[PDB]
Amino acid sequence: GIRKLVVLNPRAYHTTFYLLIPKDIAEALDIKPDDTFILNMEQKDGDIVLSYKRVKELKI
Amino acid sequence: GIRKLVVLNPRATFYLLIPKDIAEALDIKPDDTFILNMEQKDGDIVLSYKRVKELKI
Structure with a gap:
């Protein structure tokens, strides 16, 4: 009856935006x-979405 | 029968880019x-x- 959910904000750097891929998650799906x-x-x-x-x- | 599309790679911590056009289209802030x-x-x-x-x- 419980689960962790990650909340985020786009990462700005005109202006370019990115979306983080959580450390732990990247390891699970072995993101390369x-x-x-x-x-x-x-x-x-x-x-x-x-x-x-x-x-x-x-x-x- | 042709088409040009964007493909994305995780950019190192890894991040995914939000194409200028989509970001603008959806008014990303x-x-x-x-x-x-x-x-x-x-x-x-996914x-x-x-x-x-x-x-x-």
Whole structure:
């Protein structure tokens, strides 16, 4: 009856934005800098969602 | 039958970029709040960052 959820803010650096990939999580799915993701804009109950899907075929 | 698409790589701590165009389109602001939901699909992971309202930080 309980779960941890991580909250975030975009990381700014015009202005470029990024989204952190939690330490512990990156280790679980063994995220490698060469991992390839395609991003899709989606929505749920009026809340925008940015889904980053990992597709191995796209690695180079 | 042609198409140009953007592919993203984790940029090292790793971060994922929010393409200028999408960021603008969705009016991303540095104080927006997102929760990170994970899902499995086509045999692989998905990092869904939902921009929520009823939360802060």
